[PDB]
Structures are given as structure tokens and as C-alpha cells.
Design a protein around this ligand. Structure first.
Ligand SMILES: Cc1cc2nc3c(=O)[nH]c(=O)nc-3n(C[C@H](O)[C@H](O)[C@H](O)COP(=O)(O)O)c2cc1C
Ligand SMILES: Cc1cc2nc3c(=O)[nH]c(=O)nc-3n(C[C@H](O)[C@H](O)[C@H](O)COP(=O)(O)O)c2cc1C
Ligand SMILES: COc1cccc2ccc(CCc3c(C(=O)O)[nH]c(=O)[nH]c3=O)cc12
Ligand SMILES: COc1cccc2ccc(CCc3c(C(=O)O)[nH]c(=O)[nH]c3=O)cc12
Lengths: 313, 313
């Protein structure tokens, strides 16, 4: 009894991977994720140039989850491309590379360079649509016209199957509009739901202070706070995008939580906060726990229950 | 050392009140809230006509919060207006009346008839800007043009100070836009942040089923899930609407949670899920807990620390 699966013309030992930004920024981090029991890894979202990121403290965690305003600290696209082209051991697991350029032009420039390495090595593109839009505008995925433009331009520039990382939505009309945008693109083969629940605010009662420095304490939420939001987004897109895969991300701390994401429609399951807090050992625990729940239920495959969440009446 | 506040030309023994929809639908519910130690009460959001609402189960709660798709079950506006006009004992505490018409015209119709009772008896209007709009469009407060229309028409029809109940937002740009529209309306004297985090999806692992019947299990989230989102919204509106009060709602289970709301800017503090789960005894607990935090810190009044959350240098 094993959790291996095939998706996107690649084979995966199991459905687990890190969430972009967690344990993926440096060569050391990518080596560590490659040595783990995860089924796959994704790199830190990158920009054309290297970035320091925001001032610290910029990440904090708590029993219910985490808040972050990292600000895209990363080693720059040239580094992640070199990792993909020369350093990653593809015999170990598949690699996804996440791109988050600060404009459409920057994303086009990066994807034009990724394509031959994708063809040659099989690295997979996850395009982060929480990439910053023009300042004073909402993030790109919350601006449907910008979202359509980015995908038009990337599709043209890249020319190969890719995926998109989405922020959560909270309104059924918005599910309908977003999914319709995505379904205009046939090259968009997976949709990762969700990025962090945007612009939360954690306050410490003892000190009377916010807990992160950037943005007056405001940052994206992850972890237990966001599991029902994550599940809703996974299912909403699973129902609306029948010709795409959905990748679940948000609130996974256990094999039960992974099971819920798969029931909702997830094909891979990404682990952010919990992985940041527990370290890469979490992947063996998650696999064990997911296999235990499967065995108790009599399920011998992921396909037997993916997307099979039951509704009432 | 007291929790008492004087706002909107009323006196409140303490900041706590129910959140609209919890323990406020029937005469029995309103008498129970009136008998409690809460500093105020709000009625169930109402429609012109009495509504059966969405099929059951439509509310469920869990250790980290609740999900609901109630569907505005309510006794109809005439009932709540009679309660305000004839039944409520204003010597016990102030009353807010929440309205949630299904069109701008329905809201106008109700506020025209609430006005004279507001003027004579001092009932306070809370206008719910999550009232559903045209289906397939986003909820009113996620459609800024619709929001502006509603506020123009209700301001003209009512002609008295009122407040609004807002959904949460998740973008810095989005928060600014909400402030920009509300600040067009001088009669909007309070902003209640937040209504339920929309369209989440709770799934029971054992039964592999969603837990509420309407909308294929989708529903609004409250409780521990939503406290950092709530705080963010309170503080974002508190900073952007300096001539308005902000009332906090979301994730309050303890005096410590209330203290964080107040540090973020809240003047009243509303209690939804936790009151649904614990019952009205919660109010004496919250008062005692808030007073204990104030005593440890040497604060004698709420204005000492309201809006005084610290940022990092
Ligand atoms: C420290 C940190 C950095 C992150 N950076 C990125 C990023 O570079 N790209 C991205 O797509 N998402 C980023 N995320 C979002 C996560 O990939 C994930 O979508 C979110 O944390 C929710 O998953 P969780 O509940 O498991 O944390 C980051 C999250 C954290 C906590
Ligand atoms: C059962 C239920 C019914 C609700 N009905 C309404 C309503 O009629 N009008 C409204 O403005 N908010 C309604 N809400 C939202 C709450 O007022 C509150 O904004 C939300 O539950 C978050 O607060 P909490 O975290 O304390 O639950 C309802 C919530 C629940 C749980
Ligand atoms: C300049 O880039 C940013 C400034 C401030 C906030 C940011 C939030 C998100 C992002 C995109 C990268 C990312 C980050 C981040 O690097 O902050 N954190 C997340 O949880 N998700 C993400 O997708 C860039 C930001
Ligand atoms: C017909 O009215 C509705 C149908 C389906 C979902 C709805 C959700 C919210 C509302 C507004 C009333 C309300 C409700 C409600 O009555 O469902 N629940 C909340 O958590 N907040 C609210 O403001 C009406 C709905």
C-alpha cells in the first residue's frame, strides 16, 4: 500500500509538497526539501533580481497559525533557474519553480527563459498571481482584467503547461468569475488554492503591539485559521475547472487535514505553516497519517475519494 | 476603573453586545439579551416580509468556530419595529436594529418607517451591507458602486445617524476603497467590522460530508478562525475613518480578545459564535476578564487604550 501518483506527465511518490516560500529559498533549503520524504518541492517565488525582503520581524507563528509579510526575499531568478537546470536531482522528485515578478513584463522575461529548461529537464512552473500589481491596485488575482492579461502574456511567452497560485476568494460570484478567467487558458493545467488569507493583524495583549514590523503589523495568514477557507476554494475550483488539476494548500497539519483537501478535490497537497513550524520530518508523519485514515476507511487509492465530498440532500 | 462608554448620544454600561443574528430573532431572544449583562443588544437582520430561511442544518459549531448559511430567517420588519417602538425597555440598555433588505428599495422602505421611532425612542440603525445583491453579483459591500448607491439612498430616506455592518476585506487597496466610500456619508457614524468570513467549507472527515445543507456546504465563518482578520479590519477602518466609531466583531471568546479589539480601535465589541455556544452568561465573564486585564495594566477606562495598538518602530 503506497501513495504514489502520476500528474502533469510526472510521477510523484505521494501528494505532499512544501508550499511556496517555506523551506525553499536557498540551495540548502532546496536540498533539504529534496532529501525529505515529500513527493515534490516548489521553490520560493522569485523576482528577476535578488531581494532582501522586508524588515524583520516579518514572520511569526502561534498555536492557530502564522502571519507573514516577507516581501519576496529571494535569491533572484538566475539562481532558481540554475538550480532547476544544473543542481536539482530529478530522479529524487519533481520540481516546481514559482515566479512572482513585479510586472507582467518581468514575468514574461522570466518565463521565456524558463521554457527551454522546462522542455529539457521537466521543471514545472507555478505562476504566483498574488504577485504585486501596480501599487494602489489590488493584487493581480483580485483584478480580473489584469489576471486575464497576465495569463495571456504568460501563455504566449511560455507556450507550455503551467499552473497558477491563487489567493482565496470569499464570494460565489468571484469564484465564478475567476474560474472563468482561468478556463480561457488551456495551458493552465493546475490551480493551487490557496495563498495566505490576506492582510490579517495579530496583536500581542501583553505588549499591546503588533507582532510583525512591515505594513504596521498587517500580513497574510496561514495555518489553522484558514483550513475551511482553503477547502472552500479547492472545492469551488475543482467543481468549476473540470479540465484542470487543483492543488490544495492551507491549514494542513495532519493526514486528516490532507484527507479533507483531497476529498474537496486536491491532487497535490502543499504544507506551509506546519512545515515551517515542525520541519521536514512532518512529511513522514503526514504520509503515515493519510495511509492510516485510508486503511480504516477501506480506500486503496487517492482517486477513490478525490473530489468525493458529500453534500446534504 | 470602569468599562462604561458614552457614544452616539447613549450611555452603555460596558462595550459588549451580541452580534447581529445571535440570540436576537424572537421576542424571547430580545428579552433574554435585555436581561443579560450586555451593555447593548442588536436585533436579527430583517427583511420587509417574514422569511423561513435556508433549510437545516444551516449552523454548525466546532472548537475553532462556526459556519452558517442561515438565509435571513426573521420575523419581518414590522415585528422588530414594534419591539423597538413598544416593547424594549430603554432604561435597561440601548437597542440597535439591524436591517438587511434584499434590494435598495426594500432597505429604503424600512428606514423611512424606522426614522420616526429612531428619533422618538433612540433605537439605533445598523445597516447590513452583506445584504445579498442580484444573484451572480458579489455581496453589496464587495460591489463598491452598489454600496455607494445603497448609502446614498438610505442616507436620504433615513436622515439620521446610523451605522453599517461590513464584511471583511483582505487587500490594503481594498481597505482604502471601503474607507473612501464610507467617508462620503456623514450620517454613517459607526462601522461594525466584521461580518462572517464568506464562503468557507467545513468538511467532517468521518462522514466525508459537508456539515450544512445550503449552498453545497458553503457558508460564512465566525469564531477563532477569524480573530486576526477581524482585528485587521477594525484597525484598517479605525485608521481611515477618523470621524466615525468602529465597533469590533469577530473571534471574541474572552476579555483578552475584547482587549485586542479595543486596542485596534473598537468602541463596542460584539459577540457572535461564542455567545451562540456559551449563552448569555458569557457577558459577565467577559466583563470580569477585561477588568482583570485593565487592573494588571493600570488602565482605569477604555479610552486609555482604545486604538493604542503599537507598531514596530
Ligand atoms: C513565510 C512564508 C512565505 C511564503 N512565501 C510565499 C511565496 O513566496 N509564494 C507563494 O506562492 N506563497 C507564499 N507563501 C504562502 C504559502 O505558500 C501558503 O499558500 C500559505 O502559507 C497557506 O498555507 P499554510 O496554511 O499551510 O501556511 C508563504 C507563506 C509563508 C508562511
Ligand atoms: C447564526 C448566525 C447568524 C448571523 N446572522 C447575522 C445577521 O442577521 N446579520 C448580520 O449582520 N450578521 C449576522 N451574523 C454574523 C455575526 O453578526 C458576526 O458578524 C460573525 O458571526 C462574526 O463574529 P463571531 O466571530 O463572534 O461569530 C450571523 C452569524 C451567525 C453565527
Ligand atoms: C514586494 O512584495 C511584497 C510586499 C509586501 C507584501 C507581499 C505579500 C506577498 C507577496 C508575494 C509573495 C508571498 C509572500 C511574501 O513573500 O511576503 N508571502 C505570502 O504569504 N505569499 C506570497 O505569495 C509579495 C509582497
Ligand atoms: C437570502 O439571504 C441569504 C441567502 C444565503 C446566504 C446569506 C448570507 C448572508 C445574508 C445576510 C444575513 C447574514 C446571515 C444569514 O442570515 O445567513 N449570516 C451571517 O453570518 N451574516 C449575515 O449578515 C443573507 C443570505
Amino acid at each position: 500500500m503506497c501513495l504514489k501518483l502520476n500528474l502533469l506527465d510526472h510521477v510523484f511518490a505521494n501528494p505532499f509538497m512544501n508550499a511556496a516560500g517555506v523551506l525553499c529559498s536557498t540551495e540548502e533549503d532546496l536540498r533539504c526539501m529534496t532529501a525529505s520524504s515529500s513527493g515534490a518541492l516548489v521553490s520560493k517565488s522569485c523576482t528577476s533580481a535578488p531581494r532582501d525582503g522586508n524588515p524583520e520581524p516579518r514572520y511569526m507563528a502561534f498555536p492557530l497559525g502564522s502571519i507573514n509579510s516577507m516581501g519576496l526575499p529571494n535569491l533572484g531568478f538566475d539562481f532558481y533557474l540554475k538550480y532547476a537546470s544544473d543542481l536539482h536531482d530529478y530522479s529524487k522528485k519533481p520540481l516546481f519553480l514559482s515566479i512572482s515578478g513585479l510586472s507582467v513584463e518581468e514575468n514574461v522575461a522570466m518565463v521565456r527563459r524558463l521554457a527551454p529548461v522546462a522542455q529539457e529537464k521537466g521543471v514545472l512552473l507555478e505562476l504566483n498571481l498574488s504577485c504585486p500589481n501596480v501599487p494602489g491596485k489590488p493584487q493581480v488575482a483580485y483584478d480580473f482584467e489584469a489576471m486575464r492579461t497576465y495569463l495571456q502574456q504568460v501563455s504566449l511567452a511560455y507556450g507550455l503547461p503551467f499552473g497558477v497560485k491563487m489567493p482565496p476568494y470569499f464570494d460565489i460570484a468571484h469564484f465564478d468569475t475567476a474560474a472563468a478567467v482561468l478556463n480561457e487558458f488551456p495551458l493552465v493545467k493546475f490551480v493551487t488554492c490557496v495563498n495566505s488569507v490576506g492582510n490579517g493583524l495579530v496583536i500581542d495583549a501583553e505588549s499591546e503591539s503588533v507582532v510583525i514590523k512591515p505594513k504596521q503589523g498587517f500580513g497574510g495568514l496561514g495555518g489553522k485559521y484558514i483550513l475551511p477557507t482553503a477547502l472552500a476554494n479547492v472545492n469551488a475550483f475543482y467543481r468549476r475547472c473540470p479540465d484542470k488539476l487543483v492543488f490544495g494548500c492551507g491549514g494542513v497539519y495532519s493526514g486528516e487535514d490532507a484527507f479533507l483537501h483531497i476529498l474537496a478535490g486536491a491532487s497535490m497537497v502543499q504544507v506551509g505553516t506546519a512545515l515551517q513550524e515542525e520541519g521536514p520530518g512532518i512529511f513522514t508523519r503526514l504520509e503515515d497519517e493519510l495511509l492510516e485514515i485510508m486503511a480504516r476507511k477501506g480506500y486503496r487509492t487517492l482517486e477513490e475519494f478525490r473530489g468525493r465530498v458529500k453534500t446534504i440532500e
